[PDB]
């Protein structure tokens, strides 16, 4: 786990053989991570939309461990001010908002 | 409630005598709402930081009801692509991430 929101909900992830940190972001539809080298197929994707668009590489069905939970989901790889775990992967780990 | 994340976590809020909808956004530090007229004191605040800054009006200790929970917190008022309930108010309502 139960994570309070007094601080930014940053968690440890394992992806592409690397240990990283990312923000659990219920405001984000998608997961965007930088500085990861993933194997296998990708396609370009345009995201954002303010000031222009940002182009990222979309990798589908990527194995990823998030705070100890091994799941699978789409990971967008590209420049991001902060590594973000979006709703697409929070559903996979069974993460809910509770109050 | 327990809110799953398959869809955007949009909830009903009551603010400044108006009914509105806003996104529960654990990636946002602050709450930003547009098209609300709040009474009482404010000061300008610069937020964002990509491409420049956005100036908003900061109102402190604003009464707000979020999905039935009457709380108090800072509300930033200015044009925003989507109304956002940030961590500052999610803490007030006792909202946690759980998995």
């Amino acid at each position: 786990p139960q994570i309070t929101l007094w601080q930014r909900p940053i968690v440890t992830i394992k992806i592409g053989g690397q240990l990283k940190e990312a923000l659990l972001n219920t405001g984000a539809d998608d997961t965007v991570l930088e500085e990861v080298n993933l194997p296998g197929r990708w396609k370009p994707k345009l995201i954002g939309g303010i000031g222009g668009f940002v182009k990222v590489r979309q990798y589908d069905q990527v194995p990823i461990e998030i705070c100890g939970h091994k799941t699978i989901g789409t990971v967008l790889v590209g420049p991001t001010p902060t590594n973000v775990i979006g709703r697409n992967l929070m559903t996979q780990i069974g993460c809910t908002l509770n109050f | 409630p327990q809110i799953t994340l398959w869809q955007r976590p949009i909830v009903t809020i009551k603010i400044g005598g108006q009914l509105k909808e806003a996104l529960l956004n654990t990636g946002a530090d602050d709450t930003v709402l547009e098209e609300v007229n709040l009474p009482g004191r404010w000061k300008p605040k610069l937020i964002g930081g990509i491409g420049g800054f956005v100036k908003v009006r900061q109102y402190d200790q604003v009464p707000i009801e979020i999905c039935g929970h009457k709380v108090i917190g800072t509300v930033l008022v200015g044009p925003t692509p989507t109304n956002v309930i940030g961590r500052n108010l999610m803490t007030q309502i006792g909202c946690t991430l759980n998995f």
Partner: peptide, 7 residues
């Protein structure tokens, strides 16, 4: 920061 991300 502050982060509502739409494709």
């Amino acid at each position: 920061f502050n982060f509502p991300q739409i494709t």
